[PDB]
Amino acid sequence: MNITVELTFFEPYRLVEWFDWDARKKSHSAMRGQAFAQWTWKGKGRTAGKSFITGTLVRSAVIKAVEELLSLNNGKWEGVPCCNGSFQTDESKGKKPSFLRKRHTLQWQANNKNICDKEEACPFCILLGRFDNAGKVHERNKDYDIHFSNFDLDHDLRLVDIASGRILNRVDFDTGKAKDYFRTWEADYETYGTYTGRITLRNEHAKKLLLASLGFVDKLCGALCRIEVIDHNDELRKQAEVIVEAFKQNDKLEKIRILADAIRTLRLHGEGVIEKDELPDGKEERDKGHHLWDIKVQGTALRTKLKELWQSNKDIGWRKFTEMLGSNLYLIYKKETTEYYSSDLFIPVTPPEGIETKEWIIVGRLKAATPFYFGVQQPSDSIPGKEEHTSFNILLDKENRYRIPRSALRGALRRDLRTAFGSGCNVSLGGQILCNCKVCIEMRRITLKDSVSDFSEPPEIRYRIAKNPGTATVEDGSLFDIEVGPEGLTFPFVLRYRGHKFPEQLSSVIRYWEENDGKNGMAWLGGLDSTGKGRFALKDIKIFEWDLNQKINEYIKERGMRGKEKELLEMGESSLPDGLIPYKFFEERECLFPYKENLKPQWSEVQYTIEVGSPLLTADTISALTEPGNRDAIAYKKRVYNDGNNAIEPEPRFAVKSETHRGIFRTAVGRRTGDLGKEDHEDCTCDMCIIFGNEHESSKIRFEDLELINGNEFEKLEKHIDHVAIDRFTGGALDKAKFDTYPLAGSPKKPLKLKGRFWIKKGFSGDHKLLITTALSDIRDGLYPLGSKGGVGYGWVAGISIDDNVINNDYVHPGHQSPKQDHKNKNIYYPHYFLDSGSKVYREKDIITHEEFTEELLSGKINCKLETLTPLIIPDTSDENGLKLQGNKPGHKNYKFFNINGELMIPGSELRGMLRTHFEALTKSCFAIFGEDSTLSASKTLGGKLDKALHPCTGLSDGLCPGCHLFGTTDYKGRVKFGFAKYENGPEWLITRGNNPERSLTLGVLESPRPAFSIPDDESEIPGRKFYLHHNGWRIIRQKQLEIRETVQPERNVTTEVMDKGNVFSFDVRFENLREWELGLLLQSLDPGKNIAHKLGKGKPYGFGSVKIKIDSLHTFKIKRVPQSDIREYINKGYQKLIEWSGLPQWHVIPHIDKLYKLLWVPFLSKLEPDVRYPVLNEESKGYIEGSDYTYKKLGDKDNLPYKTRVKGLTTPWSPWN
RNA sequence: GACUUAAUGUCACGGUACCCAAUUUUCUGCCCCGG
Ligand SMILES: [Mg+2]
Ligand SMILES: [Zn+2]
Ligand SMILES: [Zn+2]
Ligand SMILES: [Zn+2]
Ligand SMILES: [Zn+2]
């Protein structure tokens, strides 16, 4: 007599390839998956087949359930008693069973009236098949008193349709690294989770118990069960290959990788980012467009090629098309550039009479308190049919919902239970006996569920670099990315303990994982916990219990709520099933001893807030390539799930990444102990390797995101700051070298508050805790700016708040003779002159590394004030209509003064480039920026005519010039960081009555500098660095301010906010690992003399920007305030370095230093007021004084003066040109 | 039926795809003579 019987899975069950019992021992995977669902191949080719569950496995589960049920009812079921059965086949009697039981079999007291034999037997002996005609060798199906047929899948079927190959893990508790790994085929329970078979039972005497047993089997094939009675990829890989080939024709293979990431980010922007062409077009200055999306692939641009690819691949979705194209591009870029599976003994266990076995069900929501990462292999390597990387995908199910797998949740629960108990074993994989440590005994009663989320938007991608310790730049080829689900994402957490009493340790773990009003949830599920990926908070926790000793038939009838825990969590006490009563004495964490002693002090919280008084640019490089806008650098923002809104929040939260926070702390620790300078970290017991982990041991500190909590306070949170690179010989810039960053608008009196936190392991040393707070103090002092452009002055830490739950230079330059002998100022000088430095540039291959704070070298901070001697123009070029007067005059660019959050600033890029020009001129160093590609009108280019040692330092194989050594190189971070100059005291603006904005002041037209005047013929070379005189031609501009607005066209001049002379700024120069002479030369580059000033900003040939830097304080840590005498010692030892390069310090003895200081001499600092201005173009030109003969026709003609005397008059500072 | 089990004995829910890695380095939004 047969019954048909269907078993339904409710989580992804495990599938293995079917092998027969003799050939099953050859493969370790099938030895592992004896208890799994088997998969055989219907035809040849190893691509299609049939899945089934063996009847021996279902019979093993039913017999285990029968043992548990008869132990719960003390050997009886519905009146008829059962004996203890048999589980000991003698080898002398016959062949052993194919599966030998290793567990502790539950054996009760046998109270049957008669012994069990062929004529009469108990339901235990009958369901076991003790006394039937069937045996170890199967002949016919009619010899079975009880028969379990194979359970065939109820739905040719291919393996890739049903299963996904997944690598599991075995993480060591002491080290945190996986000891080994193994593979399963996690099969789709939603489509192929129903398996139908037949059970043939002959006599009815063991019938009802069997219908009990089908209601009591909770596990088959690695999943929860209810058992009831009754090609685009090939063509896209080809097109990605031809895209990689077209990029390799341009030698842009290294961009292909980030292109893959860019395409893998395009799934977050929908179809319209390609259909409506919202890809960035690149800067309009460069005629070639975008550096990535306008690359010609087979004659057409990459944006239109991607349009054609999407139009050819509209059959698959946009997410699948972008994921497959980015995966193919990453795989082609990767191509072009341990595994462990697995004396019989019968162990009877008799529980005491009167004991109460119960089943606790703990249901809750597993909210992601942090962005989470559950690791999976690449889908090219995770093919179930066919069986180092740098791009890592998060784990998803068949419909791209995020999942917490049962294995990862179970391993994290095992780790936390090993923490809660004092002791714990490492899980042996082939023990014939059960492990007797407390963690294994408690987790043998614990069952969980594979959680999946109701949210399926694509993961954010976290991009990560390793900084080179020596150069403090990105290590080449070390960029790698992972995929994160958002924080706030909730997962249905299911736990089920099957035991006599609920353990104190597991309740301590559940209170440890749960979040409260003053407690953080602490379920570290997933990967990269060191970067704080996957800290989950348990919430909405409800525990109920089935009292299985007396209320067992309605545990069987409801099947333990094994498919409706989602129903169980929402619904309340009134609709609860019979036998399932809520759990009242779940003990709180205030009196749970293994929580308070072992779990609560295990990870100590240090939460703090970083006040950043600078703009903050943690660059999202891929997001600059996918989001619309022409910004090369935008701040990092991340997607955060809102559980209340059940969606991603519409505003992304700006944050400094937890990996950036972790790396900042890691270099802060490793620099103070010198552990960053180690060439390798393998089996290292260094302080940085103990605290932050290595490739063999996990980190004992965990870092979360520095989330910006101040972002609602700023009116415009993202400030636009556009920088440009200034040529050294032409005073203008290069349009192709312009780059605009988009940092967060941070500033001194309106700082960015960044809420970050890190967790410390229990057992930190007295030393290592002091290293951690010393790293925190180093960040607090401002040693480590956050994000990019730290040398430019971005992301500077003004301070750190810890939560309660945790001089003048006395040198006077003589100047030039002609302005001092001209009291009436009838001489007219050129607005710029060229520093006549030779071709000798000293280069050092002994490059000072950034990996440690060297004792003999000097590191500190210079507090400098900045006094404007003439009015200063630092334009805010983000708004080309910052003064709002383009409506009256179209095309007339008008800028405000540079300001972040209303308060007035000078960027440290301007100060840094100015001091870089002064230091490069001071040290006779290389022309670090030059227009190589420009031609004159001629046989050679501009860069060809420049000297070879005057060329910019490219790479660190050759030496670096002192300007390139101090301020940096593309391959080497600079050792000086120039802060943004805040404004304190002065007259603020230069008010002029003729202007409609009295703050503003229009200047003359600023045309491009002409090297044809400076280099007249082919024989003349580059004369030198162009510097501008310190004069008061701004007074001349102010006098003819009425005439300027009509004599020239509006689209040729600019009207800008102008800060008056006498204004005081304050800026910090944080210097790092400088020599004794380098600090002195830098301090001399700040304050060169009594009558020496500096020129920065717009209007330098017009007299604007004459600024005086004087130093209040030099602070040096090894923290102390350096006195005046040691400052003079540093400056004097820099002076001796200048003499040994040339071969009270008197600077004018050095000829090029004398010429540079004469260029930067201030004649009006006295009664001198020289009028210097450019000559007019012709005799009939505007602003020409008649009889002066100061037209450009006179100086341009070689008959009036020779070419060489014009070059000599351009190289002589303050030489009279009239 | 068979693909596809063996039946007096399947802890495989017996195993966290773990572990390490600062998307940053460099760059004054600058400016005068020809056609
Ligand atoms: Mg039998
Ligand atoms: Zn019996
Ligand atoms: Zn154990
Ligand atoms: Zn180390
Ligand atoms: Zn250089």
Numbering used by the authors: 6 to 160, 166 to 240, 268 to 374, 387 to 391, 399 to 443, 454 to 872, 899 to 1029, 1391 to 1571, ...
Paper text:
The RNA-targeting type III-E CRISPR-gRAMP effector interacts with a caspase-like protease TPR-CHAT to form the CRISPR-guided caspase complex (Craspase), but their functional mechanism is unknown. Here, we report cryo-EM structures of the type III-E gRAMPcrRNA and gRAMPcrRNA-TPR-CHAT complexes, before and after either self or non-self RNA target binding, and elucidate the mechanisms underlying RNA-targeting and non-self RNA-induced protease activation. A recently characterized type III-E CRISPR-Cas subtype contains a single-protein effector that exhibits specific target RNA cleavage activity with no collateral activity or cell toxicity, representing a promising new tool for manipulating RNA. Lacking the type III signature protein Cas10, the III-E CRISPR loci often contain a gene encoding a caspase-like protease called TPR-CHAT that contains a caspase HetF associated with TPRs (CHAT) domain, which is a caspase family protease typically involved in programmed cell death, fused with a tetratricopeptide repeat (TPR) domain.
The nucleotides at positions −1 to −16 in the 18-nt 5′-repeat tag formed multiple sequence-specific contacts with residues in Csm4 and Csm3, indicating gRAMP recognizes the 5′-repeat tag in a sequence-dependent manner, consistent with the conservation of the 5′-repeat tag sequence. In contrast, we found a series of sequence-nonspecific contacts between the crRNA spacer sequence and Csm3.1, Csm3.2, and Csm5, accounting for the lack of sequence specificity for spacer sequence recognition. Notably, a metal ion was coordinated by the phosphate group of −11U, the side chain of D137, and the carboxyl group of G134 and A139 in the gRAMP complex (blue inset). A magnesium ion critical for guide RNA stabilization is located in a similar position in prokaryotic Argonautes29, suggesting the metal ion observed here may also function in stabilizing the 5′-repeat tag in the gRAMP complex. By contrast, in the type III-E gRAMPcrRNA complex, nucleotides −1C and −2A within the 5′-repeat tag stack with 1C to 3A within the spacer, which are available for base pairing with the self RNA target (red inset), possibly acting as sensors to discriminate self and non-self RNA. In addition, the two cleavable phosphates were stabilized by residues in the Csm2 domain (black and green insets). Notably, these residues undergo substantial conformational changes revealed by the structural comparison between the gRAMPcrRNA-target RNA ternary complex and the gRAMPcrRNA binary, whose structure we determined at 2.7 Å.
